[model samples]
Target chain A: MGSINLRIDDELKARSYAALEKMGVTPSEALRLMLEYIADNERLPFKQTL
Target chain B: MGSINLRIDDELKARSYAALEKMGVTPSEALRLMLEYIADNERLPFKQTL
Candidate 1:
């Protein structure tokens, strides 16, 4: 199977980890799910909120 | 309430968006869910795969 690839900021990661902690989900799993979504969709599906 | 804050690398975010596409999910939703997870938990629940 193809391996996963991506870049992440330490600060962002820390924030994400904190957020995930609130939901009781693991960062790895959360990222895993997100990665899967991106891999399948090839684009963001949500409206731009940034 | 405190505002949501985070730092993310463009390259990493791009890659993450791509991965999320594969799953047919939105980056926002994915992030939202992740944040919820983190908010509920205190630390990363899953083992680091990075």
Candidate 2:
């Protein structure tokens, strides 16, 4: 698997983790959501860096 | 997708890119190879940022 592109802040990371916890999802699942979001918005697979 | 656990110094990244260039591969391909190496060693999908 490849890495995703994200400009993560502390708040985002924490919130994502919290959301994942609430949803009973693993950290990897949360990251998958982030990647899916990027892909949906950008119309391409997520890039690791800019 | 997420990040990879790589303690990459400038020299390593540079040399990796050079090797990719010599192989007519893109940076993404080089990254894919790194992940594949991790996967082949671990016998599962590569983990990011760990």
Candidate 3:
């Protein structure tokens, strides 16, 4: 398996963690889901809303 | 709002589209949700599973 690393702002990281905490999900899980969805469908799996 | 354009392999794009279609979603919407989730929480909203 491949891996990815990103340089993100500290504040952004903190805030994202907090939000995901509320949803009972982690960044890794969310990202995994995204990848799984993409791999399974071979496309992004959401509509454009903005 | 800013925009992004990606150059992806045709096969990859096709597969992603197919997956999203099965989920009844669009690439744009999926990306938008990802951005929104990040912005609202301030981080990537998923866990790492690979």
First chain TM-score in every candidate? 0.61, 0.47, 0.53
Tens-digit per-residue lDDT, A1-50, candidate 3 = 33333334455555655666666665555544554557674544345544
State the DockQ, from 0 to 1, for candidate 1: 0.14
Model 2 score (lDDT): 0.39
lDDT of 2 by residue, B1-50 (tens): 44323333344344444554554545543344333332334322323433
Model 3: lDDT to the true structure: 0.52
RMSD (Cα, Å) for all candidates, in order, is: 8.7, 12.5, 7.8
Stretches off by above 4 angstroms in model 1 are A1-50, B1-6, B45-50
Please give, for residues B1-50, the per-residue lDDT of candidate 1 as tens digits: 23333344456666777665565665556666555444555464443545
- Alpha carbon lDDT at A22, candidate 3: 61
> lDDT value for candidate 1?
0.53
- Residue B26 of model 1 has an lDDT of 55
Error of 3 at A7 (Å): 24
Residue A7, candidate 1: C-alpha displacement in angstroms: 22
Per-candidate fnat, comma-separated: 0.16, 0.00, 0.21
Off by over 4 Å in 2: A1-50, B1-7, B43-50
